[PDB]
Amino acid sequence: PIVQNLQGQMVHQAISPRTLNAWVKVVEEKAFSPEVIPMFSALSEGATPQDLNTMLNTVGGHQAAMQMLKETINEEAAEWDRLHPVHAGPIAPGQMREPRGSDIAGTTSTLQEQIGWMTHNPPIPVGEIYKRWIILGLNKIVRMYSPTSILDIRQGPKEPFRDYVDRFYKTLRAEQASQEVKNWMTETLLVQNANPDCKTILKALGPGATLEEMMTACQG
Amino acid sequence: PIVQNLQGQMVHQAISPRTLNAWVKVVEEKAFSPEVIPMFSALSEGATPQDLNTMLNTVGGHQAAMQMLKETINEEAAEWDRLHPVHAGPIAPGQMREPRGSDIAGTTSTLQEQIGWMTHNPPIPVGEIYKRWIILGLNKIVRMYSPTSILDIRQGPKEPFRDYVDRFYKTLRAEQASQEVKNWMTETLLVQNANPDCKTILKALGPGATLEEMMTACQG
Amino acid sequence: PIVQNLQGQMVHQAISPRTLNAWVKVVEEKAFSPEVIPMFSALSEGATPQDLNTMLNTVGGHQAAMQMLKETINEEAAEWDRLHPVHAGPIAPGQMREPRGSDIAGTTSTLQEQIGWMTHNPPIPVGEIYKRWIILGLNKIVRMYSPTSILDIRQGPKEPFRDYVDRFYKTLRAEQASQEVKNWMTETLLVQNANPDCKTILKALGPGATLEEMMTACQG
Amino acid sequence: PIVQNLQGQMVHQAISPRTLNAWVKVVEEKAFSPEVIPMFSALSEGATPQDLNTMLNTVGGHQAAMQMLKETINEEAAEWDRLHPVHAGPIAPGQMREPRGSDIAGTTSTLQEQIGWMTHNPPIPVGEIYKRWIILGLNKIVRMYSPTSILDIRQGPKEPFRDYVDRFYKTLRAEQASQEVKNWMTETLLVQNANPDCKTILKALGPGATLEEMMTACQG
Amino acid sequence: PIVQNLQGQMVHQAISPRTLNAWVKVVEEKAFSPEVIPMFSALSEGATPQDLNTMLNTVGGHQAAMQMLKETINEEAAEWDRLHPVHAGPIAPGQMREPRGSDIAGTTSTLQEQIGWMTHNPPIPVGEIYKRWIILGLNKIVRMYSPTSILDIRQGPKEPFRDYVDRFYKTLRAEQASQEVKNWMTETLLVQNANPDCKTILKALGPGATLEEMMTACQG
Amino acid sequence: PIVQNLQGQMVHQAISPRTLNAWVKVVEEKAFSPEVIPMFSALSEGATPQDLNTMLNTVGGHQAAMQMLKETINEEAAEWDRLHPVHAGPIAPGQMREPRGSDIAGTTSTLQEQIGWMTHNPPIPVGEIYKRWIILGLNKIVRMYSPTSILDIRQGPKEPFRDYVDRFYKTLRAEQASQEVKNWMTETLLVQNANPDCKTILKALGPGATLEEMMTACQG
């Protein structure tokens, strides 16, 4: 992608084969865990919209997610076009006007236009907008691909509380609810669906008990 | 290949063995899916025609498709020679003669000649044209190695709609239809080739809903 | 992370895929053993808080420890906010106010703010404070994942004392005890919970001898 | 090999061990397939005959082919010596006479001699000629390695035409006959030795066609 | 860490994860053999005391050896403090006093102090002192881990003398003694504790021959 | 090691960890074979003697060969001391006297002396000489693990001729002798020790037999 230059501006460079190999490995090993969402921001720093398009295309299978993200990109491009004032008239030499939905998506914009937009004055980070749209698409796709809800988790009589609370927090992270709702569910459902023995132990522990005390109490 | 040197001008470089090894391993481990076409453009950027020829030559097996690509290269070179009259003029330093059909593919041109063509003023990315030429072939190559039709696709009574839409979009990517034709064909056949209960539910929902409602309407 | 340009000004770079891939693979493979605590500081030196929280988020599984460390980070940030004399009123131009309880976590502080803090006059090592908080959280996590206590280790009648003292010192490294108590216990517990013949040999050898004499006298 | 300087003068570069290790491991792991013939050039660009000799000597297994290629190199060096007699006379400063029969084989010469030959104007392509001789030796080796002829191939009744055409083209590539007769026979023998259904479809198509049409007609 | 730059002054850097991963894996997999002592010196070139401490602490298990080497480091630091003059009072600005016994290990001295000491004129090779202390600790732990002495090695009645001489030399390399003692042992003990037939053949061949002649004398 | 600077002066470098890792892996995995003899030289294309002995001491096991090569190094140092008289008197400033028998091995000379000798005018390839000394030693190392002679090889009736000729050439290449004896034996032993059918075929073929025709006539 675009790499920094020693005491210089930002110039475009070829995509590292290591980056794409790591991306295909991580999207072929699990491809449906929340931690792959930060991984995206660990590799899409400063990348051109063309790089985003190539990364989206290089994935194998699961084209339903590709259609989902394409639809979200189209609708958000339309909303950006309607909200942002239209640009016309003589364009200043050396720079280009604010790109429309087609240009930011990379379908009609070449590499030179994206490079000029990155080095604009003031710089226009439409790559950031495109990747935040992709982040929203990833959020909705991980909502889609989550195979369980939050309220249906139940701890088995022989099931340890360790992996129980682990999967509870995994589904909590998969949930898109507000912070206060997350706090309420983590304060209630963590005991509403546990084993009865240490359920009553935690009830005896009183309200607002930290989870370390609960985990040291549910043992045995 | 030719890479943009930091705080300096671009210079020719030898092909890294790792890129070729990754290319050959991904060719031998994966079928002729559409997503391999962008992957090629993720490794052939800033490459001389000789580099592209070497990349083509490292193919392991499936030489029938290689013969198809060679024939398409020959016919495209013939078309290029036919549409470009022979450029006759003085030969002086700083000016290089017009490459022919055997020269764009790099079969009869040395690496130094390609470097001189790249450094010629004005720059001639004719080798890049050759790249797109092979891309064209790769397109039909996919259509050759995914012989399953798109009209005959039908979701079985026990076939989940997730895999149904996955294979439908795989064959769509294998298809040569334009963007609008693809959109129309999907918006028709997705509801035309579903389970009867899904058909009734989605027709009760009505047209205009995105694929999200299509998925969430007839779950199970 | 943060690097110094050769004969140049300070420049902030991204995270290389090598470091994150190695960290995630070693975390997913190796358990929550004490040796992972130094390993983190091997790869998280001079890193911005945003890089630290992205590295934290890229982990997969064991979300109970993640929730516990988030709680500890939040409470420590609140304590830092209340104890520190939070400046109020106007801020002079060209300055940067003290980090917030959420700015140190990186969830509300932009990368430009982090860069300004790093190069501030005088510099603010907020990233180091966050790293120390992470170190405390990892100590809590390794205490949580401690298999057994330290007083229950018993030497087998025929098991060699070599692996006995090895696991004793491993558990000492995994122990939550302070400095003076561990100094007291490293001179009396090992000679008290060994085979009787070697115990009496060590007792006759005299107190104050280092562990090399202990192991040589205990040789069979 | 010998690499160009960053806007400077030609400087010899050290041999990368990774390329040699990859070459030897792939040669010893997969096969003695003719696919090594082109990719060898990708690993021997701008390399002195010493580097080629070092690469050749580090091979493992099947020393009979090594003896064959050594004998071919010796006889071709003798041919070069007898066709082009050894030059005599004092060597003017700044130039150097052509390499001898042993010098061109990279045996009785040092790296500095190759550097002086390369910097000499015109540059004598001793390395290129040695590479051509190695290519001819490998062509003879792969001619030997062929376990069957080209005219005895027959297609099984219970086999798809894809494997038949694949093996026909791989054996055609493995052939060392003249290109003219090869291209003449690749349009006839493929149907002269095909299954009856392909034969009937092709003779219904009529004499003369492109292999794309042939292989699409064989489908179904 | 301390690594030279291309035609430029040395700048601070960080140890690559692959180096530490290889170091820890070879430490945990091969042995606590003397050959690891040079290996460490291969990976400790231009390394700050912080890097040395991190590389030391990244090992998993064998904590008894870690405690032993820490104790030897502490006693060596005490010896250095008592031997080298104890500076009292600050020095003129621009210079710093010699690092304390706790500063060589890096327990109390930060990386900035180590960098300042390294760049100070005259240079402070405190890292070299720490490395040689680690070398002494490795030598003593190798001597500890030797399962047998050099005096009680007996050749098997049917075991070939190749394995006998190999194990004799391997044990000798683990011996911490002068080179003259090693020469005397290799010249005397190699025949004293051998099989009667090789003993008689060795005595017939005389004591003036080298190891090669005597090992080729009584083969079988 | 010895690395050329970009159009600059000669600058010393430390040994790359990957080079020594590859060396030790190929030594431990692949048995002692002549093919690894070039593998050493490619890994030692310019290095100080200190680096040579450092990479030589990394190998674990087979210490008998290490002792043999150390003895040969000592005897070659004695030879160098005898043939090259020791010189005394004044030493020119900026230059160092020629290395002695102990200095070439690097046992007494420090890294600074090696650097000064590398940059000496005229250059002193003392380390190069050292490497050729090692070559001599490894020659007799080839004689160590040779299990049979060059005339006891026999082709079994059930064993294919390919394996027989492969082993014959392995033993021929491994064996150290003159060129004339190899030329004599490459036409006598192989025919004499072949299965009777193709042996009499070769005898009917007569003189001038080449291995290619030899074992293409032996097919069947």
Ligand SMILES: O=P(O)(O)O[C@H]1[C@H](OP(=O)(O)O)[C@@H](OP(=O)(O)O)[C@H](OP(=O)(O)O)[C@@H](OP(=O)(O)O)[C@H]1OP(=O)(O)O
């Ligand atoms: O291509 P990069 O991502 O910049 O990584 C390179 C690459 O190593 P890898 O292919 O293993 O990643 C270099 O190898 P070449 O491409 O030159 O063959 C290597 O050079 P050496 O092989 O000589 O060590 C260099 O290391 P360095 O920068 O120390 O010269 C290393 O860079 P990193 O070590 O920063 O990944």
Ligand SMILES: O=P(O)(O)O[C@H]1[C@H](OP(=O)(O)O)[C@@H](OP(=O)(O)O)[C@H](OP(=O)(O)O)[C@@H](OP(=O)(O)O)[C@H]1OP(=O)(O)O
């Ligand atoms: O550490 P791993 O996860 O096993 O990956 C390694 C590593 O490659 P990366 O540095 O890209 O991770 C090796 O490089 P080093 O760490 O030894 O420098 C490389 O070896 P080469 O550099 O010689 O290519 C090797 O490849 P191989 O297993 O073919 O030897 C490759 O393994 P993977 O290819 O399985 O990732």
